[PDB]
Each structure stands twice: as structure tokens, then as C-alpha cells.
């Protein structure tokens, strides 16, 4: 039960079934960047006050 | 407690005297059920401090 199992983990007894843990991680990486020439248009424009 | 009366009835004093504040909570020791480092952890031991 939610209480009948609660004795069994806190005292350290295996209740005949198991588990799988799942976690999430995050990293900070570095990159290089390659493109060929003229792969994009990139127009340039007017300024507005 | 200091003793009172004969020893012959002294249980039935203390049986009825602690009939109330015995089923109230728990005693300070519960750690016979506690494994080691369950005392070192912040939950489950209010008596850690």
C-alpha cells in the first residue's frame, strides 16, 4: 500500500519488485561552423530615427 | 518517579497513569529501525540536532 510499502523501503527490505531510474542531464559544448560561399542572401538596409 | 505504596500494585498505578501520554507519540529512540547515515540525513531525524 502507500503505507505498507513505506515500512519496507525505510527499513531496507526488498518488496519483490524493482525499478528503473531515469535522469536528465545538460552540458556546455563548443562548436565549429562550416558553410560554403554564397549560402545566403543577407540584404542590408535603412535606419529609422 | 519516586516509589509510592507497596510494589504489589505499582504496575496498576503506572499502567493507568501512563495510559494517556504513551499512545500520544513516540519515544526519542526510533533509531533501532534506522540504518546508518539515515541519521546523517536531514529528514527522518528531528533528533539529529
How are the secondary structure elements laid out?
This is part of a larger assembly, with two copies of chain A (49 residues).
Chain A: H1 6-11
PDB class: viral protein
Keywords: HSV2, Portal vertex, Complex, viral protein
Entry title: Structure of HSV2 C-capsid portal vertex
Structural features, described:
Chain B: It comes from Human herpesvirus 2 (strain HG52) (HHV-2). Chain B: Belongs to the herpesviridae major capsid protein family. Chain B: It is found in: Virion; Host nucleus. Chain B: This is Major capsid protein. It is classed as viral protein. This is part of a larger assembly, with two copies of chain A (49 residues). With 49 residues, chain A is largely without helices or strands. Chain A contains one helix and no strands. The longest helix of chain A is centred in the N-terminal third of the chain and has 6 residues, at 6-11. The N and C termini of chain A lie far apart (70 Å). Chain A binds chain B through residues 10-12, and chain B through 33, 35, 38, 44.
Amino acid at each position: 500500500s502507500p503505507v505498507a510499502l513505506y515500512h519496507q523501503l525505510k527499513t531496507g527490505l526488498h518488496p519483490g519488485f524493482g525499478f528503473t531510474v531515469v535522469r536528465q542531464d545538460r552540458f556546455v559544448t563548443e562548436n565549429v561552423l562550416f558553410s560554403e560561399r554564397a549560402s545566403e542572401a543577407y540584404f542590408l538596409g535603412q535606419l529609422q530615427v | 518517579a519516586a516509589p509510592a505504596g507497596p510494589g504489589a500494585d505499582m504496575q496498576q498505578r503506572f499502567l493507568n497513569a501512563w495510559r494517556q501520554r504513551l499512545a500520544h507519540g513516540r519515544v526519542r529512540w526510533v533509531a533501532e529501525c534506522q540504518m546508518t547515515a539515515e541519521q546523517f540525513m536531514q529528514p527522518d531525524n528531528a533528533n539529529l540536532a
